Amino acid sequence: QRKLYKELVKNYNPDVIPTQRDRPVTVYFSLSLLQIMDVDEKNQVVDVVFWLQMSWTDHYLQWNVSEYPGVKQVSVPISSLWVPDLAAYNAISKPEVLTPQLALVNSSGHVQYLPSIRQRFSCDVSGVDTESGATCKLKFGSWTHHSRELDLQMQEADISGYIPYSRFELVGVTQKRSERFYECCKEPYPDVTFTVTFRKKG
Amino acid sequence: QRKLYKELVKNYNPDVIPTQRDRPVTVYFSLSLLQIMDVDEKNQVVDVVFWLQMSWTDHYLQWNVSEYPGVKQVSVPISSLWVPDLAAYNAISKPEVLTPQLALVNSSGHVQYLPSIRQRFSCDVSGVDTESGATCKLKFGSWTHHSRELDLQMQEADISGYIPYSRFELVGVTQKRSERFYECCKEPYPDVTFTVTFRKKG
Amino acid sequence: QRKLYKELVKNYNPDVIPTQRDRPVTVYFSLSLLQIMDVDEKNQVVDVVFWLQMSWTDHYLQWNVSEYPGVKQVSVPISSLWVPDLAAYNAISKPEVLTPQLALVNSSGHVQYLPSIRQRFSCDVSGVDTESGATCKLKFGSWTHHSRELDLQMQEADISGYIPYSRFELVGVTQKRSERFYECCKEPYPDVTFTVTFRKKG
Amino acid sequence: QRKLYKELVKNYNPDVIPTQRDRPVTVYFSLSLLQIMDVDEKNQVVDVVFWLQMSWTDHYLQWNVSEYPGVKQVSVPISSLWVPDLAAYNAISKPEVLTPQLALVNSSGHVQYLPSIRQRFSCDVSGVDTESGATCKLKFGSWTHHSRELDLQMQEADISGYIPYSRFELVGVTQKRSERFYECCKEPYPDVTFTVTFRKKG
Amino acid sequence: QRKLYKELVKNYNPDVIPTQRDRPVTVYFSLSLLQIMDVDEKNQVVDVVFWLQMSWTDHYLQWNVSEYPGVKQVSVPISSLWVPDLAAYNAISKPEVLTPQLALVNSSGHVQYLPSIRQRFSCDVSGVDTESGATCKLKFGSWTHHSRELDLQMQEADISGYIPYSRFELVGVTQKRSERFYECCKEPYPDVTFTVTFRKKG
Numbered sequence A, B, C, D, E: 001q002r003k004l005y006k007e008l009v010k011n012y013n014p015d016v017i018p019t020q021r022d023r024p025v026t027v028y029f030s031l032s033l034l035q036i037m038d039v040d041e042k043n044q045v046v047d048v049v050f051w052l053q054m055s056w057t058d059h060y061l062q063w064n065v066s067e068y069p070g071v072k073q074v075s076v077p078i079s080s081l082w083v084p085d086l087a088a089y090n091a092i093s094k095p096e097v098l099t100p101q102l103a104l105v106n107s108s109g110h111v112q113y114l115p116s117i118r119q120r121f122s123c124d125v126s127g128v129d130t131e132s133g134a135t136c137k138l139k140f141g142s143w144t145h146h147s148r149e150l151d152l153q154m155q156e157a158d159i160s161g162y163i164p165y166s167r168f169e170l171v172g173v174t175q176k177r178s179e180r181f182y183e184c185c186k187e188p189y190p191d192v193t194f195t196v197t198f199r200k201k202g
């Protein structure tokens, strides 16, 4: 019934970005803030819990919807396939993934990974009591592949996920991707930056 | 003696949900509160310890009660078979499983997993001192499988397990499963939500 | 010299209890209190460090004292053989094993495992200042095997291991194994319960 | 298209330093301070988050730019190749690597590893309030390979990475490599030492 | 050039103590105090960071200095060879190894392991303010092997490694090995006990 798995992994090396030369693997990135845990005004850091949304197309993982019974989509362990090496640029703590590390794959080869993470970032929380509000920037981006290899494209930033209570309230979330040439390598480097603004409830 | 193990694992890939098409693996879910550890009124979080009761039928794991001596049920490591990818939609800390990660299996193929977990959840503990009491919702649910693949069915919520002493006392536990829709993915995702109400003893 | 190891592991699956049908593997259990670290009167929990003493007979692990030079007993990693799945039924934290995870095995097949553990238990430490003293019960027991598969038999509780200083002093340690029956299995269940009584030194 | 990976790992044992005899593997070391988290004046320790810049040449990892399509550089998991066993001599906590553990490799065989680390060091933070400033020395160095096997060569210390805000401000960063001697062995052990001086903003 | 590794591991099982019968593997043990982090007078525990010096002779790991080019000594991961199962008897926290887990081996077969560890011990720190000073005993010893299998021999205790500043100052370090005849089995158990005395600087 599911010899599909045996086949999908057969000739697969997850350390290889599935590019079809000059055809950069495009990954649709998106972050959804769930809650702001703490704010260390003393050391300038915020504890955040978010919901990463990543989707890309792995040509190595497609199959004939017919050659296999009624197998539309399968559930695979991220440790089995290639997954975007996105990293938090201003992080000061290792990311702690809260949810099961599993991804969904199409019969056509479309992967979807939605981990819930709690991670701490370096940020200026000076004006977290002022009505103006403290602003934190969460910069994400590939850690090794450039624009031609891995193309980052941000999608609709969902904010309806934020906790209703919570000691803090969201004043605004921006999100904007930028490509920077970096002094070297003819190839640019993309990155999505979520700008979160919040203030203590009073 | 027990060549049963060698056989049960022979052609098994634990990353594959044991469905036989138009036959969704039904898992009987149930949570039993053991004790409320702490309540962070400052950050709005509760530390809870409970033990989850999960049971399902794995057709790949059945055997002839005769072909094998007097082997009625075996004790296998969850890392060896498929196990429901249930997750706490609203958790803010990785689950810490306290008990041995072993499951029991019938000669017919009925698995049973009863782990004791300590995990922290985001919750509004404002009125934990009021006689009305603070209410927390623990939402659980499959993470990659929809209704047709994995059917969640809640069973009798046991409450006789709660610690007699404890700084807190249980005012009420509800528990109710709902089939909810999410953007994308044609199918809907079943989730069981345990609503716990407690107040500080005084 | 030691092809003994290559042979002892050859046809071994550590997930299989060494029962030779109608011959329940009997494990001699025993706990030795080393020190009481802390007592959280606010949340009702004790931090304990104890010395577990477990011994059983693995028929799969015996050899001819002659066929092998002068190899009387070997030192093997618990991850290599079957080991009792005993669990603390009243624990609120994963057990932290302090010592090397190695076991000793006889030429006849008698295993011995003595790990030092620090674990926290839920307990009523209300009267820890009273001269009467607070009493904690540490209930241990298999997690999946019943009486016919794994027979728990408690042996002499050693108390001479307790720390002379320490903020607390031992008023008494009981220890008593009990078997029961429940709704199911027609299968009984063994469990050893160490009852520790202590009070703050003043 | 990337059978390159299958080939690069084929005859590779990452526990073997890629010295091509009498030609010591030279690794270009460099640290970049990102932020000083806390200073424990009571126990004399600093919590630091730095950027580590390491680059070396692995002759075992080179390939014909032509024999392989347009594969210029690949992204490999440090657990797959040999990587400098540099250690922090005066660390009092295990290093916590924040970024993805991946390295970049040239078609010629030049590896590049840039991990972001948060680690705590033993240091005299007495005068952290004085205008003179507290000074900490972060001594790094290979731990098992001597001068002839692994040659450490420090490069330009980048300081533009430091956090603008932060409770502390950098008064000076030195950095100087020294070839020293030890009471364990008969051989020179090189080591780069970054001397950071900072004071609390007031 | 280094097929030496492929050969050194070929017929090796690291769970087997390398005793060439009637020849107890003698390990030269030695501890060097680096710094005393904290002292919990409330719970009677000290946080210590030391430097373990262990050396022994593994006959299975020797080679012809000629049969292999100019390979004098190699750097191997402790997970690859047998290493003394020494344990901290009165430890109340798992040992946290700070340095790279690698060992050095002679062409003759002499292993050397020098890990830096931070571990907490149960100790009477009552008089840490008195001029007399608090005294802590760090008892180490094999966990499964007795005198005939593993012979512990302490060597010069180096104290020049202690941190100059530090809230505490060393009043004295003794170190003395004792052979402790336990219950049964005529072969006793050797254990080295480092007695450290310190007082708060004032």
Ligand SMILES: *[C@@H]1O[C@H](CO)[C@@H](O[C@@H]2O[C@H](CO)[C@@H](O)[C@H](O)[C@H]2NC(C)=O)[C@H](O)[C@H]1NC(C)=O
Pocket (backbone or CB within 6 Å): A064, A065, A066, A067
């Ligand atoms: C995808 O699978 C279908 C069904 O197996 C393949 O169809 C074959 O060709 C025609 C069109 O359906 C049928 O008459 C044959 O009977 C099918 N052959 C088989 C093996 O049943 C189709 O060719 C496949 N296409 C791809 C992309 O591989």
Ligand SMILES: *[C@@H]1O[C@H](CO)[C@@H](O)[C@H](O)[C@H]1NC(C)=O
Pocket (backbone or CB within 6 Å): A106, A107, A108, A110, B184, B185
């Ligand atoms: C899955 O593949 C389908 C093609 O059938 C495509 O419409 C979609 O973009 C992919 N994602 C889904 C529907 O989850």
Ligand SMILES: *[C@@H]1O[C@H](CO)[C@@H](O)[C@H](O)[C@H]1NC(C)=O
Pocket (backbone or CB within 6 Å): B064, B065, B066, B067
């Ligand atoms: C099932 O058990 C029967 C009991 O009579 C026995 O003959 C045989 O081993 C098994 N038969 C099949 C087809 O599974």
Ligand SMILES: *[C@@H]1O[C@H](CO)[C@@H](O)[C@H](O)[C@H]1NC(C)=O
Pocket (backbone or CB within 6 Å): B106, B107, B108, B109, B110, B112
């Ligand atoms: C186990 O198998 C038996 C076989 O008759 C079945 O009746 C029962 O519902 C299954 N569940 C358990 C764990 O008892």
Ligand SMILES: *[C@@H]1O[C@H](CO)[C@@H](O)[C@H](O)[C@H]1NC(C)=O
Pocket (backbone or CB within 6 Å): C064, C066, C067
């Ligand atoms: C034990 O080993 C000896 C070899 O000295 C052999 O003669 C004898 O048959 C063996 N007996 C058993 C119990 O296997």
Ligand SMILES: *[C@@H]1O[C@H](CO)[C@@H](O)[C@H](O)[C@H]1NC(C)=O
Pocket (backbone or CB within 6 Å): C106, C108, C110, C111, C112
């Ligand atoms: C081996 O088991 C026998 C059981 O009779 C016992 O006498 C002997 O002391 C044991 N050896 C050990 C565990 O040291």
Ligand SMILES: *[C@@H]1O[C@H](CO)[C@@H](O)[C@H](O)[C@H]1NC(C)=O
Pocket (backbone or CB within 6 Å): D064, D065, D066, D067
């Ligand atoms: C690389 O491969 C080409 C194949 O066209 C071959 O001609 C050439 O000798 C190789 N170049 C080097 C650097 O050896």
Ligand SMILES: *[C@@H]1O[C@H](CO)[C@@H](O)[C@H](O)[C@H]1NC(C)=O
Pocket (backbone or CB within 6 Å): D106, D107, D108, D109, D110
């Ligand atoms: C690899 O790095 C070296 C460093 O000098 C550089 O010269 C070379 O161009 C890089 N790779 C190749 C062969 O292009």
Ligand SMILES: *[C@@H]1O[C@H](CO)[C@@H](O)[C@H](O)[C@H]1NC(C)=O
Pocket (backbone or CB within 6 Å): E064, E066, E067
């Ligand atoms: C050592 O190596 C030499 C030359 O390879 C050869 O005589 C023999 O293999 C070895 N002899 C001894 C005594 O180790």
